[PDB]
Curated annotation (Swiss-Prot), chains A, D, F:
Organism: Halothiobacillus neapolitanus (strain ATCC 23641 / c2)
Position of sequence motif Gates the pore: 69-70
Residue intervals of the BMC circularly permuted domain: 4-105, 107-205
Protein's UniProt keywords contain Cell membrane: no
Lineage of the organism: Bacteria, Pseudomonadati, Pseudomonadota, Gammaproteobacteria, Chromatiales
Biotechnology: Expression of 10 genes for alpha-carboxysome (Cb) proteins (cbbL-cbbS-csoS2-csoS3-csoS4A-csoS4B-csoS1C-csoS1A-csoS1B-csoS1D) in E.coli generates compartments that resemble Cb, contain RuBisCO and have its catalytic activity, showing it is possible to make artificial, functional Cb using these 10 genes. Cargo proteins can be targeted to these organelles. Artificial Cb assembly in E.coli requires csoS2-csoS4A-csoS4B-csoS1C-csoS1A-csoS1B-csoS1D (but not the gene for carbonic anhydrase, csoS3).
Protein name: Carboxysome shell protein CsoS1D
Record note on quaternary structure: Homotrimer. Forms a dimer of stacked trimers, the same faces interact. Probably forms a CsoS1-CsoS1D-CsoS2 complex.
Amino acid sequence: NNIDLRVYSFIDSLQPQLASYLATSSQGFLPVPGDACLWIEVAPGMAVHRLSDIALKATNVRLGEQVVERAFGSMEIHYRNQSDVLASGEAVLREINHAQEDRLPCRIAWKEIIRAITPDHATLINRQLRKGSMLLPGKSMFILETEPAGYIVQAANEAEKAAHVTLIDVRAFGNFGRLTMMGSEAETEEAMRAAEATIASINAR
Amino acid sequence: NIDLRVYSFIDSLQPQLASYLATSSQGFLPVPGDACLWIEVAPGMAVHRLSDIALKATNVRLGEQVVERAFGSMEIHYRNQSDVLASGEAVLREINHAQEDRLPCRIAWKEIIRAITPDHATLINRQLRKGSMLLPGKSMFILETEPAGYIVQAANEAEKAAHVTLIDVRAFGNFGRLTMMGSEAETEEAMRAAEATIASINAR
Amino acid sequence: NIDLRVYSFIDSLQPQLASYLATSSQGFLPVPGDACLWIEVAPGMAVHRLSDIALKATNVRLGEQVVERAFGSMEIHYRNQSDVLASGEAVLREINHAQEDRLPCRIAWKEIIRAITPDHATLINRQLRKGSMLLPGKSMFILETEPAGYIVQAANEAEKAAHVTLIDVRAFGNFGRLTMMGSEAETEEAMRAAEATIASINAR
Amino acid sequence: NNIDLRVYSFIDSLQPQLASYLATSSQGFLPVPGDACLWIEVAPGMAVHRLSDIALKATNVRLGEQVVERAFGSMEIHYRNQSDVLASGEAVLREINHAQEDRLPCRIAWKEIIRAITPDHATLINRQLRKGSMLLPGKSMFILETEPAGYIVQAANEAEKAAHVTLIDVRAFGNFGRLTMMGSEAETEEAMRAAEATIASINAR
Amino acid sequence: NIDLRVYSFIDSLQPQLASYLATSSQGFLPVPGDACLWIEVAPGMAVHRLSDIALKATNVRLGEQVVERAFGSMEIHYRNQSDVLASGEAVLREINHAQEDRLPCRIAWKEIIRAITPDHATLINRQLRKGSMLLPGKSMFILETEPAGYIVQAANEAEKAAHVTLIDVRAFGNFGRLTMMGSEAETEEAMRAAEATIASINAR
Amino acid sequence: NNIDLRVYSFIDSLQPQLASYLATSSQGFLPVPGDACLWIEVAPGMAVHRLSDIALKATNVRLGEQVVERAFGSMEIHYRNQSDVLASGEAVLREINHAQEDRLPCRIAWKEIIRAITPDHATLINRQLRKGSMLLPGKSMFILETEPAGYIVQAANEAEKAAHVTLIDVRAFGNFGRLTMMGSEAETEEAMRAAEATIASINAR
């Protein structure tokens, strides 16, 4: 029709903490470490229904997320094998007549390491809809925020793959994605460069 | 002072619709047959004095009351039509608007999706679904309106004119959204009733 | 050193049951036609080791795992009857018990209430049902068994046999609960099937 | 950075009902009657992470609230000793290079008393996200809405202090702060007078 | 074969009680001045039927309906005393019990705690409190009854007799619990009224 | 005043992850790492009200948990310095007239390390009332069940002291206490060794 591709973001193999987080937090069918994964945001939001039905029928792919927000909607599919995910992705692009590149770039609205987290700051992040692991006092904190939000998952994945960090929280919905990780001062800075390179990769497309 | 955005009067509520309202409302629970009046005004803080007025006028019961970012919704209902309409005219008289000064009802989505898969059916059933269970194999009617509250009258008629099942009605925020299930033939007919109901709202 | 409370096998999940566990389970989700298996052992904490044993033996998925006070519940499921049966036999070998060492399924309530009041339907819908809404004027069948886990299989053969609407299944704790809706002829036929399944089970 | 000061609201002594409301609706460390309190809203909202770390390391103050919204974010510190609270306050002000007066003015969105509340009106307010006390039918109802949201906590403290009213609810996030208090006609009238007197003092900055 | 566990008749609801019930009840909601009736029966599941009869009898609404593992609780209420008394008499004739057949109300706890510390008020406030806020420095009446259904009538009389504030009345389970705030004098009056009400109840 | 003493467990310094878990799910004042901690279960469980008033009113101690159940009640107090916690203990103990050894023995109802946790099994543990860190597939899992429940907190404390494990969960209320810890095959057996150790002492009363 007139569907704007806003996020197309593809992870070929989910890192273990990231998949575990999606499994625990997800309202749909659950992924496990190693599953390929496709995140998509389109506008208008309601178009997520037709596209999800198209994606689910083409392959053996399973639906992980589906949400209709005000201006846009989000869907995520995932399968043990890369093939089905990209095969369903093509279907979605061919139906909306968009190339992947027609996607929106990924603004970095906040990127920061915070060293020596107080126990009060940690307690606060840990009580507020925290579905991942416990942020612990004294450790360092990578925090990142993007616009659009869907990209935070892939950023989060490359962070974990590149650095011995612990995943605290991935908020992938709404207008702004947000990723919180914990680790030593040195681990978290590795996590940050990678995620910045991953973001660098997307923008060039 | 006050602007009237939604004014949607339902003279008698279909059983599923009323049952769903009763199952999700945090007010006084409607039953099938109840008359029912949806009103959204702006600023949102006004529904307080406005609900006070409607409630003090008649024997009518308050079903909903939400004050949102830019506007608020209020919902009254009673087994006697005249009580609901009487409260309605009283609310209009306070804000000094005619039932016609409401915003038109724009359609932001109308679609049927045939042969729903299990996965797609479950995601819907698992997230904010307080109605009945969407089942794989059936066709899905989905309807989105701006402003939201009109979706209730559209949901009500579509249950009258067609043999469909209520999955979900979300009547708050900027966008109303509706999900009904059934045979391709049923859900197409449920779409026409909603298309018609909206058209009559547009005539104001 | 473990006692085998519930063993219950379902070769092919009825659609509405699969959609209900899919919408209410905190594990991996089933689709219609899936094969399913329900286990309750005592001590309760035995379910972890057994879920490890069963998950490793095949491609089967884990739909529920709950350690309760007296005992512990677990539910595996797969698209093929073979992986479900293969994993259940492994769990039997490990606890050193045959399938018929399970406890009998005691019916502790069975009743059909025709012409459900709207108030009565409204209360049942509000109190945490994840299924379909109980509509007023229709007939209700409620059943309750001890132990709970069998209720899922009774819910399954009841949908197999009768054109009812599932409303609520509760498979954890001491007593299981089934809630169905339909016409009198529909609800009567389901209660008959459900009764028949439980007699089947009690033959071991 | 280019951090923006939106709300700087200092309370010297927390009123009992208000302290008790915050101890019940907040997800941090909890306040008691008499604690000094400071509420800061800054833009962009991810900045509240560094600013909070700065505050907990400067003094012994504790963290009550920490919330990141899309365009802005909000924090709240408190300690028995007002010293520590204003000290931690100045440390935040130095990092953002903003004086207290640089804060946004408090505009009144809504300001109403409604007499003789019906039982149905009362119930819906009691049933939706109210964490203060029950609103009873017959009594009068004072409702105040302010923009930005953070100053509603200072109006709520001054209202409770000046008049014998009951706190029903204070919502201090989003764009608009909303406050619900119950009393007689006279009690809510005094409370409403105290509210606007505090908003005007603030707006002298 | 139904055992009358509780039968507690409230002629008229005090506003904090009525307000509390309306904010925490999952069913239809009361207002100050309604009559109101609590019933516990065994077995639990018998409450559906007994709700069914009570609603048919008069114009009474259904306030609460909860099926515990061993017993079940229902709550009907109406603006007028006539309809509650009549609808309850019908419940009694069905189960073939007089009101006297109800279980004596025992007091498992009755205590005032004066000058409540902040951390104590805060823990009570945050954990399942739907009444008004408990503030520090004040006195706290707590009462625990067995059976639980009576704590509601003890909460009515206590509020009626003292100038106290209602914090919580949890009326399900085996144990009733009441929490109320006030000066140490008002809480001692609220407790003595409660004590007397139970005495009057077991006088029959 | 006829009060049974069911659990009396003193924790001299809360290990970091355990303090952080209590903090995420505590509904009183939150403990920070390093705090001392005293868990008490008494029957009739309505008695924890006075016993918390006594304990609070005697020292700087803070109330972290308090619950009334059918057969008993549980309270927990905690503070920066151990002197206050222990003193409040004696105030409590003398108020109910029992000594520290009048506590029930702590029977170990289940103890197991399960190696190579599958993703499915890890996911379902993560989805159900999990408020610690993510259990991750392939790692080993320590599980512990005690009766009464309050001791699982010292067992969890000690098992974090002696071992380099991760805390996933600790259900410290009801009849039975349940504890889920993660690590390699070496870290979980050490933790379990600490766990058996600490209970052995508790059983000497």
